Design a protein around this motif. Structure first.
Motif, PDB file in Angstrom:
ATOM      1  N   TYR A 150       0.966   2.681   4.533  1.00 15.82           N
ATOM      2  CA  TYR A 150       0.544   2.207   5.606  1.00 15.82           C
ATOM      3  C   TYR A 150       1.345   1.602   6.603  1.00 15.82           C
ATOM      4  CZ  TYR A 150      -3.116  -0.388   8.442  1.00 15.82           C
ATOM      5  OH  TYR A 150      -3.975  -1.019   9.319  1.00 15.82           O
ATOM      6  N   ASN A 195      -3.282   0.841  11.188  1.00 13.33           N
ATOM      7  CA  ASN A 195      -3.985   2.189  11.586  1.00 13.33           C
ATOM      8  C   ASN A 195      -3.263   3.576  11.473  1.00 13.33           C
ATOM      9  OD1 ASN A 195      -6.378   0.337  12.068  1.00 13.33           O
ATOM     10  ND2 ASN A 195      -7.147   1.762  13.471  1.00 13.33           N
ATOM     11  N   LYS A 196      -2.148   3.471  11.053  1.00 15.60           N
ATOM     12  CA  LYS A 196      -1.596   4.742  10.842  1.00 15.60           C
ATOM     13  C   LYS A 196      -0.697   4.934   9.436  1.00 15.60           C
ATOM     14  CE  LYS A 196       2.727   3.341  13.249  1.00 15.60           C
ATOM     15  NZ  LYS A 196       3.471   3.533  14.490  1.00 15.60           N
ATOM     16  N   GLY A 197      -0.723   6.128   8.858  1.00 17.03           N
ATOM     17  CA  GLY A 197       0.083   6.237   7.607  1.00 17.03           C
ATOM     18  C   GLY A 197       1.083   6.913   8.089  1.00 17.03           C
ATOM     19  N   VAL A 198       2.203   6.993   6.968  1.00 24.88           N
ATOM     20  CA  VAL A 198       3.610   7.630   7.252  1.00 24.88           C
ATOM     21  C   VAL A 198       4.285   8.134   5.950  1.00 24.88           C
ATOM     22  CG1 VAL A 198       4.825   5.616   7.148  1.00 24.88           C
ATOM     23  CG2 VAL A 198       5.814   7.755   8.062  1.00 24.88           C
ATOM     24  N   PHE A 199       4.488   9.422   5.796  1.00 26.80           N
ATOM     25  CA  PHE A 199       5.066   9.992   4.590  1.00 26.80           C
ATOM     26  C   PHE A 199       6.434   9.771   4.345  1.00 26.80           C
ATOM     27  CE2 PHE A 199       1.391  11.851   2.629  1.00 26.80           C
ATOM     28  CZ  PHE A 199       0.308  11.791   3.748  1.00 26.80           C
ATOM     29  N   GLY A 200       7.036   9.841   3.182  1.00 26.94           N
ATOM     30  CA  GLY A 200       8.441  10.029   3.111  1.00 26.94           C
ATOM     31  C   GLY A 200       8.764  11.412   3.309  1.00 26.94           C
ATOM     32  N   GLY A 201      10.131  11.595   3.333  1.00 22.44           N
ATOM     33  CA  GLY A 201      10.593  13.082   3.462  1.00 22.44           C
ATOM     34  C   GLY A 201      10.610  13.829   2.072  1.00 22.44           C
ATOM     35  N   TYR A 221       0.931  -1.441  -0.038  1.00 23.45           N
ATOM     36  CA  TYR A 221      -0.110   0.255   0.207  1.00 23.45           C
ATOM     37  C   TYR A 221       0.869   1.281  -0.019  1.00 23.45           C
ATOM     38  CZ  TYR A 221      -4.191  -2.814   0.802  1.00 23.45           C
ATOM     39  OH  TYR A 221      -5.216  -3.691   0.807  1.00 23.45           O
ATOM     40  N   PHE A 246      -1.100   4.920  -6.301  1.00 25.39           N
ATOM     41  CA  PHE A 246      -1.654   4.131  -5.062  1.00 25.39           C
ATOM     42  C   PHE A 246      -1.408   2.432  -5.302  1.00 25.39           C
ATOM     43  CE2 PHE A 246      -5.602   1.981  -6.372  1.00 25.39           C
ATOM     44  CZ  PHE A 246      -5.956   2.622  -7.720  1.00 25.39           C
ATOM     45  N   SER A 283       3.783   7.757   0.261  1.00 31.48           N
ATOM     46  CA  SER A 283       3.042   7.209   1.385  1.00 31.48           C
ATOM     47  C   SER A 283       2.882   5.688   1.517  1.00 31.48           C
ATOM     48  CB  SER A 283       1.642   8.135   1.516  1.00 31.48           C
ATOM     49  OG  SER A 283       1.049   7.915   2.694  1.00 31.48           O
ATOM     50  N   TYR A 291       6.331  13.050  -2.685  1.00 30.70           N
ATOM     51  CA  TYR A 291       6.256  12.279  -1.339  1.00 30.70           C
ATOM     52  C   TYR A 291       5.673  11.052  -1.571  1.00 30.70           C
ATOM     53  CZ  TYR A 291       6.452  17.294  -0.277  1.00 30.70           C
ATOM     54  OH  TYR A 291       6.730  18.624   0.008  1.00 30.70           O
ATOM     55  N   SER A 311       1.724   4.739  -1.711  1.00 32.46           N
ATOM     56  CA  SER A 311       1.376   5.769  -2.349  1.00 32.46           C
ATOM     57  C   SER A 311       2.250   6.975  -2.930  1.00 32.46           C
ATOM     58  CB  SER A 311       0.159   6.389  -1.857  1.00 32.46           C
ATOM     59  OG  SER A 311      -0.818   5.602  -1.636  1.00 32.46           O
TER      60      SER A 311
END
Lengths: 223, 212
Positions: free
Chosen positions: B92, B95-101, B33, B50, B90, B88, B35
């Motif tokens: 999964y 229950n939380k997402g996180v983006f790249g720098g 997952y 995605f 992204s 950027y 993105s």
């Protein structure tokens, strides 16, 4: 069309509070989960919080856990983010974003397809100085006019023209951080020449730190 | 957590550039997952990829996604001028997402854009406040490097010069501005003042006068 609009931004001292709102339209806000994502200056995107359609699922980033409070009012089609005890590292551009599908984690499954324009949030203990606004008059088949936003502190200032109705032909520019420690900015619009004596051009400068709101009518010089 | 991303990427017009996105076994390497998002200056992000490699409607075939272990990659073939932006990734994470720098993508070797220069004299309102400022505005130029030189008549100005750093506007082109600060008595002392904009070897000059 689908649309999200964030409100509630401004400057606030470290330790104080601030509440953000996100107005939704164009899609069934009743069923979709919405999220907050911020963009810190110099850094990248950072997820803030998430809330499901019925508020049954709520999540926060570790940096704002126990600090922010997300909520929503499905009747008003509005999302909220109560930010208390703000820190300098909370200075960012906060985005309202919906997922591709109404599920909670579906925004992570299939991406966040719709984003708002964002609302700026500044968290600093700096001093405040209001800008002086001077008109940059044109020469009475196009002509350039603008206004000078001079010697203010801190960032930022917002400049619109004709209460926002004048957006085409408007040139945007960044601010100088002058050697005096104060910023200066200038906004300029390019308009047809045959309208200088006909239309009225007014630049709307808003410097919320100093609570300064100036409306300066810019008109041709009388040589 | 942290998703590692190179700060800057580059590729020539028509070439290809791959932007890596490195996480751990609990985000990038734990699910399919991932993105990808594109953000032009002054505008909201746009979903480009995605589920690692799927493209939404409205995204050209030039953008393609792939993943290998803890590293997801975004390849942009046939690079174009409008592809210059920030990217950027992204992922999964439970229950939380996180983006790249984030990675700034520069499209190298494109046709130049000549700047449009406009110089404003001091307004009568500023002169009545016993101040004077010359406002030189430079827009719609590419690439971003530019030198701004001020001149009193034909001689170089002594002091009182402030100049922005060139930054891209909403039309994806660069814009800058330079401010020459003077007293009202200095402003009316010289025959003319000039803003000289040097960009990619070409020089533009705009001139104002206190009498004219």
């Amino acid at each position: 069309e689908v649309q999200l609009l964030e409100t509630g931004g401004g400057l606030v001292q470290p330790g104080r509070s601030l509440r953000l709102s996100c107005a939704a339209s164009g899609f069934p806000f009743d069923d979709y989960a919405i999220h907050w994502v911020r963009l810190a200056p110099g850094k990248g995107l950072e997820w803030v919080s998430s809330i499901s359609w019925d508020s049954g699922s709520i999540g926060y980033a570790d940096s704002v856990k126990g600090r922010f409070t997300i909520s929503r009012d499905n009747a008003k089609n509005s999302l909220y983010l109560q930010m208390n005890s703000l820190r300098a590292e909370d200075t960012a551009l906060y985005y309202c974003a919906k997922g591709a599908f109404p599920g909670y984690s579906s925004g992570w499954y299939y991406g966040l397809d719709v984003w708002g324009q964002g609302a700026t949030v500044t968290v600093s203990s700096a001093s405040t100085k209001g800008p002086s606004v001077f008109p940059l008059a044109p020469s009475s088949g196009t002509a350039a006019l603008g206004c000078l936003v001079k010697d203010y502190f801190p960032e930022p200032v917002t400049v619109s023209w004709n209460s926002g109705a004048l957006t085409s032909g408007v040139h945007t520019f960044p601010a100088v951080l002058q050697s005096s420690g104060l910023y200066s900015l200038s906004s300029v619009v390019t308009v047809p020449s045959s309208s200088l004596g006909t239309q009225t051009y007014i630049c709307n400068v808003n410097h919320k730190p100093s609570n300064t709101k100036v409306d300066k009518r810019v008109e041709p010089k009388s040589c | 957590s942290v998703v590692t991303q190179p700060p800057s990427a580059s590729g020539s017009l028509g070439q290809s550039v791959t932007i890596s996105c490195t996480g751990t076994s609990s985000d990038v390497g734990g699910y399919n997952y991932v993105s990808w998002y594109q953000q032009h200056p002054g505008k909201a992000p746009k979903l480009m990829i995605f589920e690692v490699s799927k493209r939404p409607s409205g995204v050209p075939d030039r953008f393609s996604g792939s993943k290998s272990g803890n590293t997801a990659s975004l390849t942009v073939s046939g690079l174009q001028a409008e592809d210059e932006a920030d990217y950027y990734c992204s992922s999964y994470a439970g229950n939380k997402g996180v983006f790249g720098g984030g990675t700034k993508l520069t499209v190298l070797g494109q046709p130049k854009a000549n700047p449009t220069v406009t110089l404003f004299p001091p307004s009568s309102e500023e002169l009545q406040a016993n101040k004077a400022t010359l406002v030189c505005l430079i827009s719609d130029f590419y690439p971003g490097a530019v030198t701004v030189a001020w001149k009193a008549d034909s001689s170089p100005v002594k002091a009182g010069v402030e100049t922005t750093t060139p930054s891209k506007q909403s039309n994806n082109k660069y814009a800058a501005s330079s401010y020459l600060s003077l007293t009202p008595e200095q402003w009316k002392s010289h025959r003319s003042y000039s803003c000289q904009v040097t960009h990619e070897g070409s020089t533009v000059e705009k001139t104002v006068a206190p009498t004219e």
